[PDB]
C-alpha cells in the first residue's frame, strides 16, 4: 500500500559499494548494466574507509599473497583516465622480532623471500638504524621488504566507482537492500523507494555478507567480523619520522607507520564481534600505545584520531569469489579479511570474469589463482 518506483532491470546487482563491490562493479561495468546498492550515504563509511592503507605482499595465506601480488600491476599502471595521481607510494615494511623467536623470524624471512626476492634479514642493529626510536634491548632482528607500499585508498576506491559510472552503471547510496527474493527468474532486491532486478546478485556487503545471504535464503559462509582499532598521534618534537617504514611486530601485536607528518599506531587486534558500525575500544587504544611506548622511546600524548573497523574472515583465512552452490545467480565477493584493499584489483577482475562465466585472465592464472581456490565450495566437504 506504499508507493514504490517501477522496478529497475539490470544484469548485475552489487550489494555494497566498498572496495569489494566497487572493484567487482568496475570490471563488470563494461559488459552489462551494473547497479550498486549501498546502505550508507557514502560508499567508504565501513571497512574500506578504516584501513591502514598498506600494500604488504608477505601477509596472509598463500591465496591472499597470490591475489595481492597479482593486483600490483593495476595499482602501479592503471588504465588512462582511472585516476589523477599515483595509487601507490613507497613504504617498505619492517617486521621486528620483539619476542626473541629466531626460528619464527627465519621462517617468515624464508617464506617472504620466496615471494619477494628483495626481502632481507636484518640484525637488531640494522633494525634500529632504520627506526632509531627502537629500544635496542627489545629488538632481536627483523625482516625488511623494500617493495611495500602505501595505497591512496580514496583515489583507488573513487576510481573504481567513477569507472562504473562512466560505463553507464549506477552507484546508489542510501539504498540498503531490505529484502531479497528470487522472482520470475531474477534476483529482486527491495530498497526503501523501489526494487531492482537482475539475473545476478553480487554479495559484496563486507561484514554483512552473511546477513545478505540471510535475506535471500542462501546458506551463509560462517563469516566472522573482527575488530581492529587504530589511532593517529603526533611525533615528539625533533623526531623526523616521515620516511620510516611500516613497523610491525613479528607476532602482530602492534604496528606503527608514518601517515603524512603524523604516526599511525595500532594494537593490530582481531576481536570477534557482530557486524555493526564499530567503534574503537579504550582498551584497544591503550594497549597499542603501551606497546609502542615499551618498544620505542616515543611518548604518546593524545591521539588526534581514533577509529576501528571490521576485518571479516571465513574459517580458512582465504577470500571468497564464486557462485553459491545450489543458489543460481548468487555470487559471493566476501571474506576480504585484512587484505581487501591490496587484493582489490585481482579480486575485482577475477570475480567479474567468474560472474560472466569467463575463464580467469592469464595474468591472474600466472600468479597461481584458479576458480576452485576462490570458490565458497571449498569451505565444505
Ligand atoms: C579496520 C582495518 C582494516 C584493514 C587494515 C587496518 C584496519 C584498522 N589494514 C591492516 O591492518 C594491514 C596491516 C598490514 C597494517 C589493511 C586492510 N586491508 C588492506 O588491504 N590493507 C591494509 O593496510 N584492512 C582490511 C580492509 O579494511 C578490508 O578488507 C576491506 O575494507 C573490506 O572491504 P569490503 O568492501 O569487503 O567491506 P566494506 O565494509 O568497505 O564494504 C561493504 C559495504 O556493504 C554495505 N552494506 C552492508 N549491508 C548492506 C545492505 N543491506 N545493503 C546495501 N549495502 C550494504 C556497507 O554499508 C559497506 O559500505
Swiss-Prot record:
The record's induction entry says: Induced by growth on D-arginine, D-lysine and 2-ketoarginine (2-KA), but not on L-arginine. Repressed by DauR. ArgR could be a transcriptional activator of the dauBAR operon in response to the presence of L-Arg.
User: What Enzyme Commission number(s) does the record list for this chain?
Assistant: 1.4.99.6
Query: What controls its activity?
Result: Inhibited by D-arginine and D-lysine at high concentration.
pH dependence of activity: Optimum pH is 8.7.
Q: Matching InterPro entries, A to Z? A: FAD-dep_OxRdtase (IPR006076), FAD/NAD-bd_sf (IPR036188)
* One function term, GO molecular function aspect: D-amino-acid dehydrogenase activity
Residue numbers for the site described as Important for specificity toward positively charged substrates? 93
Q: One short Pfam family name for this protein?
A: DAO
Family of the protein in this entry: Belongs to the FAD-dependent glycerol-3-phosphate dehydrogenase family.
This chain's protein is named FAD-dependent catabolic D-arginine dehydrogenase DauA
Q: Which gene encodes it?
A: dauA
Amino acid at each position: 500500500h506504499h508507493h514504490h518506483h517501477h522496478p529497475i532491470e539490470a544484469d548485475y546487482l552489487v550489494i555494497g559499494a566498498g572496495i569489494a563491490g566497487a572493484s567487482t562493479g568496475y570490471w563488470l561495468s563494461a559488459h552489462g548494466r551494473v547497479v550498486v546498492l549501498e546502505r550508507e550515504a557514502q560508499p567508504g563509511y565501513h571497512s574500506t574507509g578504516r584501513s591502514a592503507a598498506h600494500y604488504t605482499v608477505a601477509y596472509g595465506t598463500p591465496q591472499v599473497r597470490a591475489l595481492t601480488a597479482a593486483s600490483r600491476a593495476f595499482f602501479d599502471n592503471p588504465p588512462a583516465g582511472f585516476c589523477e595521481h599515483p595509487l601507490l607510494s613507497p613504504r617498505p615494511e619492517m617486521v621486528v622480532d620483539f619476542s626473541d623467536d629466531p626460528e619464527e623470524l627465519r621462517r617468515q624471512y624464508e617464506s617472504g623471500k620466496a615471494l619477494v626476492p628483495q626481502m632481507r634479514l636484518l640484525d637488531a642493529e640494522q633494525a634500529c638504524s632504520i627506526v632509531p626510536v627502537l629500544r635496542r634491548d627489545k629488538v632481536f632482528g627483523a625482516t625488511y621488504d623494500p617493495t611495500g607500499a602505501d595505497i591512496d585508498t580514496d583515489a583507488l576506491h573513487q576510481g573504481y566507482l567513477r569507472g562504473i559510472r562512466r560505463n553507464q552503471g549506477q552507484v546508489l547510496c542510501n539504498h540498503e537492500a531490505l529484502e531479497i527474493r528470487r522472482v520470475d527468474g531474477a534476483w529482486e532486491v527491495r530498497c526503501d523507494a523501489g526494487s531492482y532486478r537482475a539475473a545476478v546478485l553480487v554479495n559484496a556487503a563486507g561484514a554483512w555478507c552473511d546477513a545478505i545471504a540471510g535475506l535471500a535464503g542462501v546458506r551463509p559462509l560462517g563469516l566472522q567480523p573482527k575488530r581492529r582499532s587504530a589511532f593517529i598521534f603526533a611525533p615528539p618534537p625533533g623526531i623526523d619520522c616521515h620516511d620510516w617504514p611500516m613497523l610491525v611486530s613479528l607476532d602482530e601485536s602492534f604496528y606503527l607507520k608514518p601517515d603524512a607528518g603524523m604516526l599511525l599506531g595500532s594494537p593490530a587486534n582481531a576481536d570477534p564481534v557482530e557486524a555493526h558500525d564499530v567503534q574503537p575500544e579504550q582498551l584497544d587504544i591503550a594497549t597499542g600505545m603501551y606497546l609502542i611506548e615499551e618498544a620505542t622511546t616515543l611518548t604518546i600524548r593524545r591521539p588526534e584520531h581514533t577509529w576501528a573497523g571490521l576485518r571479516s574472515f571465513v574459517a580458512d583465512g582465504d577470500l571468497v569469489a564464486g557462485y553459491a552452490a545450489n543458489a543460481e545467480g548468487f555470487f559471493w565477493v566476501a571474506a576480504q579479511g585484512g587484505y581487501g584493499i591490496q587484493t582489490s584489483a585481482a579480486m575485482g577482475e577475477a570475480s567479474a570474469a567468474l560472474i560472466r562465466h569467463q575463464p580467469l585472465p592469464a595474468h591472474l592464472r600466472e600468479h597461481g589463482l584458479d576458480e576452485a581456490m576462490l570458490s565458497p565450495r571449498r569451505l565444505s566437504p
